[PDB]
Design an enzyme around this catalytic site. Sequence first.
Site, PDB file in Angstrom:
ATOM      1  N   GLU A   1      -5.294 -11.235  25.707  1.00  0.00           N
ATOM      2  CA  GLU A   1      -3.905 -11.641  25.830  1.00  0.00           C
ATOM      3  C   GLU A   1      -3.840 -13.140  26.098  1.00  0.00           C
ATOM      4  O   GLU A   1      -4.840 -13.777  26.439  1.00  0.00           O
ATOM      5  CB  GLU A   1      -3.203 -10.860  26.950  1.00  0.00           C
ATOM      6  CG  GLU A   1      -2.899  -9.394  26.631  1.00  0.00           C
ATOM      7  CD  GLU A   1      -4.032  -8.695  25.888  1.00  0.00           C
ATOM      8  OE1 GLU A   1      -3.918  -8.508  24.654  1.00  0.00           O
ATOM      9  OE2 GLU A   1      -5.052  -8.359  26.530  1.00  0.00           O
TER      10      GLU A   1
ATOM     11  N   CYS B   1      -8.123  -9.030  28.316  1.00  0.00           N
ATOM     12  CA  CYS B   1      -8.917  -8.673  27.143  1.00  0.00           C
ATOM     13  C   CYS B   1      -8.847  -9.759  26.080  1.00  0.00           C
ATOM     14  O   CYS B   1      -9.864 -10.360  25.722  1.00  0.00           O
ATOM     15  CB  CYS B   1      -8.446  -7.339  26.574  1.00  0.00           C
ATOM     16  SG  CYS B   1      -8.622  -5.974  27.705  1.00  0.00           S
TER      17      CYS B   1
END
Length: 825
Positions: free
Chosen positions: A465, A463
């Site tokens: 990270e 996402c």
Amino acid sequence: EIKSPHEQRLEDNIAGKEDIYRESHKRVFKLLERFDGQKPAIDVERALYFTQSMAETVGQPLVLRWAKALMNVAKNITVMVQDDQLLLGRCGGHDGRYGILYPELDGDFLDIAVRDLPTRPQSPASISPEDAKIVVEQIAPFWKGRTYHEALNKALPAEVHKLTYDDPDGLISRFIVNETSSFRSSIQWVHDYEVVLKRGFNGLKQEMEEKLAALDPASPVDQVDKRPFIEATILVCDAIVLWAKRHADAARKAAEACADPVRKAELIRMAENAEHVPANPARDFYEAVQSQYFTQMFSRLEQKTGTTISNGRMDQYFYPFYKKDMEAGILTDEKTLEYLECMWVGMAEFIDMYISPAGGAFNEGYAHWEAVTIGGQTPDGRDATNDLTYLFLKSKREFPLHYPDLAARIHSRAPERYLWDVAETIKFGSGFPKLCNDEECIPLYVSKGATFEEALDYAVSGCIEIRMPNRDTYTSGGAYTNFASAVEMALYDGKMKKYGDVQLGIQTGDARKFKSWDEFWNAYVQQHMLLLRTTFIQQYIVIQTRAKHFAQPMGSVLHALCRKHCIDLHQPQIPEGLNFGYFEFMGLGTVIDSLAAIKKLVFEDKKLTMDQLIDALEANFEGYEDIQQLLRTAPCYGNDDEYADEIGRELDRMAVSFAAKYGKEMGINNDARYVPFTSHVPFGKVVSATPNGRVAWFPLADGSSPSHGADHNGPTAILLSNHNTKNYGMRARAARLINVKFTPKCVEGDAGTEKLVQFIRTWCDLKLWHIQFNVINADTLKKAQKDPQKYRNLIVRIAGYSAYFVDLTPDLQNDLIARTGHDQM
């Protein structure tokens, strides 16, 4: 109202005009037009040959069993050449869109999936009757009592289990403390693709063969622990090379069968690519793309990496190949785009299938986050924007699929030209790229043990990270925790209307009898901390259980620390590794606004009693609509309103402070994160009406964005509220996801592009981790709802990823529609 480029392309679709960029992307447009609009199919080949080998190797070390199973896949899986493709490599025998199966993870769901997947509301998939027979007769039987999910379901103590699942078998989640290790093999991940491009798997195999020859034959640690790991990586090197070689044979066979001399020559070139890479170092840009593509595709066969395996800093490790081929006159910018977009098409045909119900609900619209990172900084502290950086942005504007998952790194000295092109790409109106802030995550990571060189070289993963592919070692899926349920449990004595009389939380008393804000606040804190205790206890069990069920020989051989210490990535502790784990704070906006409505309207201003409030909630505001309107006047998160934001800051402080204290005895960072997937839809479906005026079963606030329609003071106040609810004096935090929606008029023209650039620089200064934008008119979403077939190509940004609006359930569509569309900045 002006229209975004995406909305104009939709109008051209409806009129029947050819896409304006089709003529300059003709090959890949022909490619993507072949699988447009089809529901993906389940392919069983990877699961079949994986199971057949694992069934013969019970007792052997797991990492070596895995490499043997991947060799059996490589030898037997269907290999094909797609018409007009320039790239080789596929994870199934199906044409068009397909997903594969991972019985080692969730094989106990295979009977449910065979029956319920084709009609599931979220991300359905078809399976042929012949493949269904293979699933239930040849794949599922061996895995009975051997899947990770079965082991986790049995390992959870009763007090944790009741906040995790609704049924004794763990087939249905309660969406309170939601484990996520059971519907993906691991969290997101980025391979070190450059070491493949520079040394090939032959070079890696040679390195591992030297470690095998250096083992002490009398050392029990060398022979029992290190040798099976080493033998596993050597075998997996052979497996991916053989798999590539089989693709070379298929291309040669297709070349002979093809009369077109031009396409015949392309097929031979492709056969020669597959015969060289990924075994050997890549020698040009075409080989470099094919080598990287073989590696990431074979990775899908190896395991179901969370969000699908991410791709790293492609504009950096591809640049030396691009630059040499350009200067030698054997490459053009258009040919570069053609190679890259053939890779996007192949990735678009692979659907990351979640066969369990909770997995599907977390991943609406065939959700995928194969993060491709561009921009940022070099490992020696310089800006990293190059010619490839701009080509990736150009491709995302003109290539019409929501692939790849483009992520742009931002730092305080990012070039003006780069930020301008990023802002214009956002203005195309499909959500790309998402932004990751060097200024937030790099000091957090050097504080937690990373060197500046490896922190500066981070890749976006999943996402939003970040990964250091030769230093990160933590792979365990984290808990997703519903703090809105803590508000409800504080109202109803630790019960939830969804689950009736099940004693879920602490018995905190009848909230109708509470006499002070201190009393209700104390009741919420007791449920809040219970969710935190349950979260970390669950994670500790997950870490121990995953170490017995998952191995990753190819991913480990691409990891310098795994090669050095000869240990598989999914073990809990790897020497010299850094471990960045997460638990999810879900529903921040819902929790802040609920608590602020109670503090302000019930106890401070005394406009209503706890009895009147809970009467309205239990009635779902039916017959109490004046109360619902009153609750919506209280202070709300996302407005730079200190009354609301200090409550959220205390909520964050409790979570981060708990993370700081109890992560270390699990041997990891287990940091508070606000990244939702689409879990705020099922998390909302189990929470009844809340004191902020939100109706029952409505989605929670997304990420760390404000509650739907609660942001009334412009877009910049969203950024300030995010800063104001953080605790920068502590470090036990990770990313927050921010969704902002502008209308196209709001950012129209060069003046609007300049406004967006300054918005981004403000976001960077505030040390906020992530942001992404929808640029769309409200009527487009409503028209798509009323006539989905006419607007079937509408792409919208959801949560780190974009998807077709018509593929989303009504609940998630209502989330997107109810997000405030800002008409001025």
